[PDB]
Design a protein around this ligand. Structure first.
Ligand SMILES: CC(C)N(CCCNC(=O)Nc1ccc(C(C)(C)C)cc1)C[C@H]1O[C@@H](n2cc(Br)c3c(N)ncnc32)[C@H](O)[C@@H]1O
Ligand SMILES: [Zn+2]
Length: 264
């Protein structure tokens, strides 16, 4: 199963649907169908009726429809290493952006047992906390079990990071990833964005309001950032498809990221 097909079908692109047809043809010895028989993405494919499938593919449509129902009832397991890398990719993107946007002087990293910074180049005082620190890193980790009822009046400077540290309730100045609502009342959902300050380079166009790059100030994303945006979106989809959700302090504002780009 190609990697994209391990995502829930709602995340499948038009090219993913076409690769699904080819996989299904070989796995089930079906009559070859033109790759454009289902010229749509997975969101659209889920809207078709079984009749629609039969009309589009008289020879294999019913089978394809049932295959889709089985995939929907029994999601495929994702790869732990790819999901690890995806989550780390998102973590670095989101925390890097938050620090650039709001210039927090301190980050309180709660639930980090290894004392590894996700954004090592940030100009910020990084502080680590964990209820069970790794013995080889405890010398620089505060042994602490966070509970809102006990600590809501602490860590009010800077920003708190809870990256899969599933506490009872998060304080208002937090960045959160949680694997699957009262825990989140002080926060808002974090919508998808991509931010990059790497140099633009020119050697399918990308149209998207969520590509926060110097070259998208004028709507003409460079090839380099187009590529990096699509790779980042793939990581983000793999993480959301696997059941993680991202939450953030309510003042988080992507226009603060657009303002990092200046006109000289
Ligand atoms: C960050 C990490 C170390 N640990 C991850 C736990 C959750 N794991 C998880 O959600 N993993 C996962 C989810 C889904 C998948 C797939 C296969 C479905 C994709 C795979 C893995 C948590 C770290 O945080 C520390 N911890 C936990 C609590 Br709760 C806590 C606390 N209250 N105060 C301080 N430290 C705390 C703990 O002591 C501990 O250090
Ligand atoms: Zn660019």
């Amino acid at each position: 199963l190609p990697a994209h097909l391990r995502l829930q079908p709602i995340y499948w692109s038009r090219d993913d649907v076409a690769q699904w047809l080819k996989w299904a043809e070989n796995e089930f010895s079906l009559r070859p169908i033109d790759s454009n028989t289902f010229e749509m993405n997975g969101k659209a494919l889920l809207l078709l009726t079984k009749e629609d499938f039969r009309y589009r593919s008289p020879h294999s449509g019913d089978e394809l429809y049932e295959l889709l129902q089985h995939i929907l009832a029994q999601p495929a397991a994702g790869d732990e290493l790819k999901i690890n890398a995806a989550c780390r990719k998102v973590q670095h993107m989101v925390v890097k952006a938050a620090l650039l946007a709001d210039k927090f002087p301190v980050l309180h990293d709660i639930g980090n047992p290894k004392a590894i910074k996700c954004v090592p180049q940030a100009d910020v005082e990084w502080k680590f906390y964990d209820a069970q620190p790794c013995s080889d890193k405890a010398y620089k980790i505060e042994e602490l079990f966070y509970s809102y009822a006990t600590h809501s009046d602490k860590f009010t400077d800077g920003v708190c990071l809870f990256w899969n540290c599933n506490v009872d309730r998060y304080p208002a100045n937090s960045i959160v990833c949680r694997f699957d609502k009262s825990a989140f009342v002080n926060l808002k959902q974090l919508p998808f964005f991509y931010y990059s300050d790497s140099p633009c380079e020119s050697h399918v166009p990308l149209k998207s309001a969520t590509c926060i790059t110097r070259c998208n100030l004028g709507g003409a994303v460079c090839r380099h950032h187009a590529n990096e945006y699509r790779l980042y979106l793939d990581a983000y989809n793999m993480m959301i498809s696997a059941g993680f959700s991202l939450w953030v302090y309510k003042q988080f504002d992507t226009y603060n990221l657009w303002n990092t780009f200046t006109r000289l």
